[PDB]
Amino acid sequence: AFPVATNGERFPWQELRLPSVVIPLHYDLFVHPNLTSLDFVASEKIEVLVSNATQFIILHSKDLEITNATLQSEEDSRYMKPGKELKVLSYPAHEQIALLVPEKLTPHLKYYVAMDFQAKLGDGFEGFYKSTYRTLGGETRILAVTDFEPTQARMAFPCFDEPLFKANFSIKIRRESRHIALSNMPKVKTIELEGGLLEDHFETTVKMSTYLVAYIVCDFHSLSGFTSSGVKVSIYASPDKRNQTHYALQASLKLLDFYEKYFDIYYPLSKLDLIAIPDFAPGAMENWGLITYRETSLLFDPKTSSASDKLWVTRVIAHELAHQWFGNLVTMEWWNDIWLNEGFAKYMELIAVNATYPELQFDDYFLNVCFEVITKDSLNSSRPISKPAETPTQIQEMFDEVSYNKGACILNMLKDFLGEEKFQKGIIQYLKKFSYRNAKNDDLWSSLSNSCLESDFTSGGVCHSDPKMTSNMLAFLGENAEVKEMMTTWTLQKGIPLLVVKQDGCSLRLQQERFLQGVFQEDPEWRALQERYLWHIPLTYSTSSSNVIHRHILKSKTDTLDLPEKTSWVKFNVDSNGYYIVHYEGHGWDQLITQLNQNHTLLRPKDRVGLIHDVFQLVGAGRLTLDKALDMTYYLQHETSSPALLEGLSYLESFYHMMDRRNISDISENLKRYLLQYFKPVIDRQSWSDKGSVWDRMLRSALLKLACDLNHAPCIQKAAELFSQWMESSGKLNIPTDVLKIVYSVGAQTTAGWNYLLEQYELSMSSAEQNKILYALSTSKHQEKLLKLIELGMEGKVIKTQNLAALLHAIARRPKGQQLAWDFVRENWTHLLKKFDLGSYDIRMIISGTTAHFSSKDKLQEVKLFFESLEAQGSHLDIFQTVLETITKNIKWLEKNLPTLRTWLMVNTRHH
């Protein structure tokens, strides 16, 4: 048959997508939450318009007791005040309710749908839920906060919980006298009810999707300032943490300005609120006018927050602010095109931080975003940027490295192609065109391809007003359709192309092929995954003679350009701005490496980190033996650009940790030696201080951490000295932030230090400190402590459970812990599920956070079996395949190149 209701009747409607016959225009929403009962009583009146006559209305509701349902109208006199009662049937399987009407409704007539509902405050990071913080005095205090994206709005009021059903919202909220209440838009009025309660009436909203509605009740304080635009920006936090909001304010004002100018679009609201929520699963959520954060994302305290931390805090404020346009002013049509929000937001981070905090050096850190997402696009299990999704759980999965980074990287790839100007003018022509409504994937390429430059040029020139037929316009319309084709290739093909370059004297044979990790070229598995995959890759290259940047658009599977000067080497994808790996056949890889050991300044600094990255990724592909990737780090002795230095190193440091976790002592013991010597010079220049530039500071941290993990006797001596000095000061002497984490994890290696550290985790007012303390706590050798941390996190009283996920991962990466963590997950999967949504980001990082590092044929089968057991019940996530392929990639990489690592390091000890 078809759906059956809770009362055992029927649902008029069978799909989980909603019906487009009734569409909502306005929500009168009223919420009265009682915070000492931990429940809420609410009501709502939805002005709807029906386009096609109907017998039944369909909404979403979940875990919501509905206790009254009427229908009124002022255009259809049958439902004239008071109005006839409706009868509701709940179909909990699609999270839908059906309101059933007495008489067929009239097309083109507005009705008001009214419901009273109630529920207990949720206790789990979604919906309208409870949250606790700690005061400085030791008091513990409660607030209630909403988190809705993507589909939990339906858990706090009945509604049409899809983006595109955009409406206006009117919120009134009732509160005790000791609380305040915030929501999306500033408060108009506060009427005093008679018992002493208060009713906050909020300015009603501009048209917006449901997942963005927010309300909060709490007792936070705030610092306020104004933009040059006239917005009141206010950072809200726990009373005692108010100090820590100053930089949030500083940066968000500067940023909100920048965004307004760059988009040519004012922020539409009158207020903008940043609040720091103590219990909060995401990094932060872009509620229009009321942005919510983990404290670690928004709060900054200078005695304890690191300079990296400030870069982080500046990044997420950049990101959420960008959503005000990309997300709220323009929302994706459906969750397939979620990258239309996140992709653009991740990218604006870069332009906006670079624009407003050049000192934060964020342009040298953006290649990590692409590099990370690349190692997941090197597997078959990867998806494309736009993929269909229908159930809640699929939608949540849609928020991943792909939706965020691949989207942000191909954007930055597009910009280099079109140029900042022509890119900005296409962005404005899109946010302006789709303001207050929705846009699908294609719409974005359309307005970015039909972008005009220098305004309209001459009004009556090359743009839409009274244009002039010229052989430029036929190539402008031709170049416009060229780019709309090329991008659509990037957005619907999974994976990332690898371009093969062969230099045969003035002749370069270009080949493209999907890049694949843990699969060789001579294999049965490889030429069947080269199915139909072909991209329009906009190439770039500089030769060894001239610094000229040539630019060709390869649209074929083979192609040949002609080199005129025919010189020493040729570096493709200059500055690395293009989403693709280049591998040189012949002596190409050999010419470039010698160039690095001779000068190395003959290749621009981005070219280098691209090479370093490209090189090692290609031994993952079998296309290069490991001794040519290691041979490159020899020039790091002279390397002066910190980015290249740190990429080089991490690769080396990855290996050391791969050698531990297994017992590969002799190799691990030699990596330790090839690092501590041969990078001794640079390590020895490092201050134990916060003095220097941002990359100076970052490199000190990176390096001093390296030597103290490798038991380098001096470093561990000095970090100990600072630690006991700190503890013998009862916290009176300050440790420089940049060695703060290193000192705690050196001190943690003893039960004293450790127990003092755990005791001060519970007393610290700086969640930046607490986070560093946790890491240190996690680095303990005893499995007694490690497990106590784990259980403390489950409880959620001492270590708040929002950290459990990340805690498990710190433990599992370290050898004395990888097993404990993996055992704990399997022995508790059911229990862990009651706390998190399978498909929540928290679950996906517990699953891959304890399995991804595995690299032996035995562990693989534990997992394939554990995953199989999960699938058996109501369970399935894409992370299952990606974990497997990754462990596989590691097994292959170990057995193909381990003897070469072993032998390379042995050789090096001979020559020096």
Ligand SMILES: *[C@@H]1O[C@H](CO)[C@@H](O[C@@H]2O[C@H](CO)[C@@H](O[C@@H]3O[C@H](CO[C@H]4O[C@H](CO)[C@@H](O)[C@H](O)[C@@H]4O)[C@@H](O)[C@H](O[C@H]4O[C@H](CO)[C@@H](O)[C@H](O)[C@@H]4O)[C@@H]3O)[C@H](O)[C@H]2NC(C)=O)[C@H](O)[C@H]1NC(C)=O
């Ligand atoms: C969430 O729900 C909680 C309860 O679960 C509510 O808290 C209660 O709120 C009600 C109403 O605000 C309170 O009820 C009133 O309490 C008075 C007693 O207060 C004493 O306080 C001091 C002690 O220092 C004495 O000096 C004083 O004389 C009292 O002994 C009663 O006397 C009240 O009755 C009289 O006054 C009212 C006020 O106008 C009149 O209407 C009556 O006719 C009557 O003459 C009244 O019963 C109750 O005390 C609160 N309890 C607690 C523990 O706080 C929250 O208000 C609610 N919050 C929200 C947002 O909904």
Ligand SMILES: *[C@@H]1O[C@H](CO)[C@@H](O[C@@H]2O[C@H](CO)[C@@H](O[C@@H]3O[C@H](CO)[C@@H](O)[C@H](O)[C@@H]3O)[C@H](O)[C@H]2NC(C)=O)[C@H](O)[C@H]1NC(C)=O
């Ligand atoms: C629901 O939200 C929409 C926004 O998406 C509201 O539309 C906006 O309505 C206002 C006022 O009706 C328009 O303001 C303008 O102000 C100047 C001031 O003098 C006036 O001269 C203009 O003629 C205009 O009214 C605004 O342009 C409009 N914006 C959009 C995008 O439509 C709508 O009013 C909201 N509905 C309710 C019931 O609140």
Ligand SMILES: *[C@@H]1O[C@H](CO)[C@@H](O[C@@H]2O[C@H](CO)[C@@H](O[C@@H]3O[C@H](CO)[C@@H](O)[C@H](O)[C@@H]3O)[C@H](O)[C@H]2NC(C)=O)[C@H](O)[C@H]1NC(C)=O
């Ligand atoms: C990060 O911010 C800096 C600061 O604006 C950006 O650098 C600037 O980029 C613009 C456009 O790329 C430069 O304009 C052009 O410069 C070249 C240099 O010769 C010139 O020939 C062109 O005709 C044009 O004037 C601008 O000069 C440059 N400023 C500086 C100080 O370098 C940078 O682009 C930003 N990065 C990103 C990724 O947005």
Ligand SMILES: *[C@@H]1O[C@H](CO)[C@@H](O[C@@H]2O[C@H](CO)[C@@H](O[C@@H]3O[C@H](CO)[C@@H](O)[C@H](O)[C@@H]3O)[C@H](O)[C@H]2NC(C)=O)[C@H](O)[C@H]1NC(C)=O
């Ligand atoms: C690796 O290649 C770079 C680029 O050629 C080398 O830097 C360059 O070194 C030469 C000297 O061998 C410099 O020449 C000098 O130029 C000044 C005027 O600019 C002139 O007045 C002097 O009499 C002298 O001829 C050249 O300027 C310099 N390039 C830059 C940008 O400063 C680098 O030294 C090479 N690495 C080596 C040789 O180890």
Ligand SMILES: O=C(NO)[C@H](Cc1ccc(O)cc1)n1cc(CNS(=O)(=O)c2ccc(-c3ccccn3)s2)nn1
């Ligand atoms: O950016 C957002 N919204 O626009 C945030 C997440 C965020 C905020 C600031 C950042 O600098 C980066 C990411 N966000 C997602 C959701 C609902 N989906 S979720 O599955 O529960 C989930 C949470 C976090 C997820 C994540 C986190 C890193 C990478 C990939 N993914 S994914 N709510 N807020």
Ligand SMILES: *[C@@H]1O[C@H](CO)[C@@H](O[C@@H]2O[C@H](CO)[C@@H](O)[C@H](O)[C@H]2NC(C)=O)[C@H](O)[C@H]1NC(C)=O
């Ligand atoms: C909703 O109503 C509209 C308009 O009454 C329907 O649109 C008509 O559909 C028929 C079907 O072939 C066409 O021949 C007409 O030309 C359409 N007219 C208009 C004005 O759109 C629509 O099919 C109805 N859909 C549902 C699901 O009820």
Ligand SMILES: *[C@@H]1O[C@H](CO)[C@@H](O)[C@H](O)[C@H]1NC(C)=O
């Ligand atoms: C539903 O509305 C009617 C209107 O007369 C009211 O009497 C009734 O108490 C309401 N139900 C509730 C508040 O649960």
Ligand SMILES: *[C@@H]1O[C@H](CO)[C@@H](O)[C@H](O)[C@H]1NC(C)=O
């Ligand atoms: C916050 O700033 C004020 C002003 O200097 C100071 O009195 C207070 O002690 C500060 N608190 C912290 C934790 O820095």
Ligand SMILES: *[C@@H]1O[C@H](CO)[C@@H](O)[C@H](O)[C@H]1NC(C)=O
């Ligand atoms: C690779 O992915 C494709 C499409 O997602 C799928 O058909 C194929 O089964 C995958 N490879 C393997 C070995 O299963």
Ligand SMILES: *[C@@H]1O[C@H](CO)[C@@H](O)[C@H](O)[C@H]1NC(C)=O
């Ligand atoms: C490594 O080898 C030594 C040699 O006996 C052994 O005692 C130790 O337990 C091994 N470590 C692991 C993790 O197997």
Ligand SMILES: [Zn+2]
């Ligand atoms: Zn986002």
